Design a protein around this motif. Structure first.
Motif, PDB file in Angstrom:
ATOM      1  N   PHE A  78       0.807  -1.062  -0.030  1.00 57.27           N
ATOM      2  CA  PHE A  78       0.334   0.000  -0.057  1.00 57.27           C
ATOM      3  C   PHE A  78       1.319   1.106  -0.065  1.00 57.27           C
ATOM      4  O   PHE A  78       1.789   1.124   0.902  1.00 57.27           O
ATOM      5  CB  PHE A  78      -0.994  -0.370   1.308  1.00 57.27           C
ATOM      6  N   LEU A  79       0.553   2.469  -1.113  1.00 58.24           N
ATOM      7  CA  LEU A  79       1.090   3.576  -1.212  1.00 58.24           C
ATOM      8  C   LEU A  79       0.271   4.234  -0.323  1.00 58.24           C
ATOM      9  O   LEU A  79      -0.646   4.684  -0.916  1.00 58.24           O
ATOM     10  CB  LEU A  79       1.315   3.852  -2.202  1.00 58.24           C
ATOM     11  N   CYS A  80       0.850   5.265   0.881  1.00 58.79           N
ATOM     12  CA  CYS A  80      -0.430   5.965   1.740  1.00 58.79           C
ATOM     13  C   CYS A  80       0.795   7.042   1.931  1.00 58.79           C
ATOM     14  O   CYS A  80       0.907   7.264   2.237  1.00 58.79           O
ATOM     15  CB  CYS A  80      -0.063   5.336   3.398  1.00 58.79           C
ATOM     16  N   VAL A  81      -0.745   7.679   0.660  1.00 60.51           N
ATOM     17  CA  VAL A  81      -0.059   9.198   0.076  1.00 60.51           C
ATOM     18  C   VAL A  81      -1.558   9.805   1.098  1.00 60.51           C
ATOM     19  O   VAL A  81      -2.809  10.133   0.896  1.00 60.51           O
ATOM     20  CB  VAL A  81      -0.424   9.397  -1.410  1.00 60.51           C
ATOM     21  N   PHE A  82       0.035  11.293   1.295  1.00 62.36           N
ATOM     22  CA  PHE A  82      -1.116  12.316   2.074  1.00 62.36           C
ATOM     23  C   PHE A  82      -0.400  13.784   1.067  1.00 62.36           C
ATOM     24  O   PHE A  82       0.694  12.991   0.083  1.00 62.36           O
ATOM     25  CB  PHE A  82      -1.115  12.650   3.515  1.00 62.36           C
ATOM     26  N   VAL A 112       4.547   2.533   2.343  1.00 59.68           N
ATOM     27  CA  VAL A 112       5.214   3.602   2.445  1.00 59.68           C
ATOM     28  C   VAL A 112       4.187   4.663   2.291  1.00 59.68           C
ATOM     29  O   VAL A 112       2.988   4.814   1.773  1.00 59.68           O
ATOM     30  CB  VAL A 112       5.957   3.210   0.726  1.00 59.68           C
ATOM     31  N   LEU A 113       5.090   5.707   3.526  1.00 62.32           N
ATOM     32  CA  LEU A 113       4.305   6.558   3.299  1.00 62.32           C
ATOM     33  C   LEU A 113       4.342   7.207   2.346  1.00 62.32           C
ATOM     34  O   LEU A 113       6.469   8.327   2.200  1.00 62.32           O
ATOM     35  CB  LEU A 113       4.330   6.706   4.809  1.00 62.32           C
ATOM     36  N   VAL A 114       4.044   8.491   1.910  1.00 64.26           N
ATOM     37  CA  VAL A 114       4.359   9.576   0.124  1.00 64.26           C
ATOM     38  C   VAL A 114       3.565  10.851   1.329  1.00 64.26           C
ATOM     39  O   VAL A 114       2.572  11.125   1.171  1.00 64.26           O
ATOM     40  CB  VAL A 114       3.676   8.667  -0.274  1.00 64.26           C
ATOM     41  N   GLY A 115       4.835  11.840   0.715  1.00 64.74           N
ATOM     42  CA  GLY A 115       4.299  13.095   1.122  1.00 64.74           C
ATOM     43  C   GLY A 115       4.382  13.857  -0.029  1.00 64.74           C
ATOM     44  O   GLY A 115       5.479  14.217  -0.520  1.00 64.74           O
ATOM     45  N   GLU A 126       5.212  19.472   8.009  1.00 69.14           N
ATOM     46  CA  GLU A 126       7.261  18.975   8.134  1.00 69.14           C
ATOM     47  C   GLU A 126       7.429  17.430   7.940  1.00 69.14           C
ATOM     48  O   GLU A 126       6.757  16.654   8.131  1.00 69.14           O
ATOM     49  CB  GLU A 126       7.801  20.092   9.121  1.00 69.14           C
ATOM     50  N   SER A 127       8.872  17.393   6.827  1.00 73.38           N
ATOM     51  CA  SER A 127       9.296  16.230   7.135  1.00 73.38           C
ATOM     52  C   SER A 127       9.186  15.668   7.640  1.00 73.38           C
ATOM     53  O   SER A 127       9.176  14.185   8.150  1.00 73.38           O
ATOM     54  CB  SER A 127      10.706  16.231   6.011  1.00 73.38           C
ATOM     55  N   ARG A 128       9.899  15.829   8.831  1.00 79.42           N
ATOM     56  CA  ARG A 128       9.913  15.677  10.501  1.00 79.42           C
ATOM     57  C   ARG A 128       8.410  14.388  11.062  1.00 79.42           C
ATOM     58  O   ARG A 128       8.804  13.398  12.067  1.00 79.42           O
ATOM     59  CB  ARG A 128      10.547  16.197  11.631  1.00 79.42           C
ATOM     60  N   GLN A 129       7.782  15.577  10.846  1.00 81.58           N
ATOM     61  CA  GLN A 129       6.278  14.903  11.001  1.00 81.58           C
ATOM     62  C   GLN A 129       6.091  13.661  10.268  1.00 81.58           C
ATOM     63  O   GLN A 129       5.597  12.783  11.466  1.00 81.58           O
ATOM     64  CB  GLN A 129       5.190  16.194  11.071  1.00 81.58           C
ATOM     65  N   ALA A 130       6.108  13.918   9.331  1.00 81.47           N
ATOM     66  CA  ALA A 130       5.699  12.538   8.757  1.00 81.47           C
ATOM     67  C   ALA A 130       7.077  11.201   9.486  1.00 81.47           C
ATOM     68  O   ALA A 130       6.628  10.160   8.702  1.00 81.47           O
ATOM     69  CB  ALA A 130       5.658  12.806   6.964  1.00 81.47           C
ATOM     70  N   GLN A 131       8.247  11.835   8.863  1.00 80.28           N
ATOM     71  CA  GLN A 131       9.431  10.907   9.728  1.00 80.28           C
ATOM     72  C   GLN A 131       8.831  10.309  10.631  1.00 80.28           C
ATOM     73  O   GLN A 131       8.956   8.418  11.026  1.00 80.28           O
ATOM     74  CB  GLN A 131      10.174  11.101   9.587  1.00 80.28           C
TER      75      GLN A 131
END
Ligand SMILES: Nc1nc2c(ncn2[C@@H]2O[C@H](COP(=O)(O)OP(=O)(O)NP(=O)(O)O)[C@@H](O)[C@H]2O)c(=O)[nH]1
Ligand SMILES: [Ca+2]
Ligand SMILES: [Mg+2]
Ligand SMILES: [Mg+2]
Length: 166
Positions: A78-82, A112-115, A126-131
């Motif tokens: 699953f590609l989990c996109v926001f 995989v989480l996708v921003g 922010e990148s760190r929040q999604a990391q």
């Protein structure tokens, strides 16, 4: 020839279709046509292995939430996109992850989480929040732009490499 069943999920408008079409067809969809459920297939070489990507492009518009249980059963990864300019879409990721997690009866689903939309400057995630979210799932975080193609192949191919770790 290995077949990989990928499913792209996430809130409406985050760019699921634009990412998939960039990967498969190499152009950017500028307009917004909401998706019901479309599938794409393409033969590619990934790390020396010829394989078939079967990609299911799902609906983010909350009308078709009933079809979610069906595809969360079939998909292998699953590609989990926001979108990084849409804080609500980031908060919605949990709903998708838990649903995958509940439906699969597994805390160990290839994801995989996708921003997406990292070409836009009105960033509210922010990148760190999604990391941090990806870390708690034990999955990679990758930023993409379907518009510029930045990270697009990396996101999908990383998901294939997650399926391969089982
Ligand atoms: N700037 C920019 N716009 C993007 C990007 N990805 C998608 N968009 C734009 O955002 C809009 C929605 O894209 P779309 O792919 O249709 O989103 P979706 O997640 O598939 N929507 P749905 O869940 O309703 O099917 C379109 O206008 C598209 O051009 C991106 O990386 N950058
Ligand atoms: Ca276009
Ligand atoms: Mg779509
Ligand atoms: Mg903030």
């Amino acid at each position: 020839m290995t077949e990989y069943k990928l499913v792209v999920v996430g809130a409406g408008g985050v760019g699921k279709s634009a990412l998939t079409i960039q990967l498969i067809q190499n152009h950017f969809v500028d307009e917004y046509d909401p998706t019901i459920e479309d599938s794409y297939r393409k033969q590619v070489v990934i790390d020396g292995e010829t394989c078939l990507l079967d990609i299911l492009d799902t609906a983010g518009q909350e009308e078709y939430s009933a079809m979610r249980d069906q595809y969360m059963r079939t998909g292998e990864g699953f590609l989990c996109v926001f979108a990084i300019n849409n804080t609500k879409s980031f908060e919605d990721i949990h709903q998708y992850g838990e649903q995958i997690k509940r439906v699969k009866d597994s805390d160990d689903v290839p994801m995989v989480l996708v921003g997406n939309k990292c070409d836009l400057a009105a960033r509210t995630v922010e990148s760190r929040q999604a990391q941090d979210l990806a870390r708690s799932y034990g999955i990679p975080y990758i930023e993409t732009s379907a518009k510029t193609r930045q990270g697009v192949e990396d996101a999908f191919y990383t998901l294939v490499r997650e399926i391969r770790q089982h």
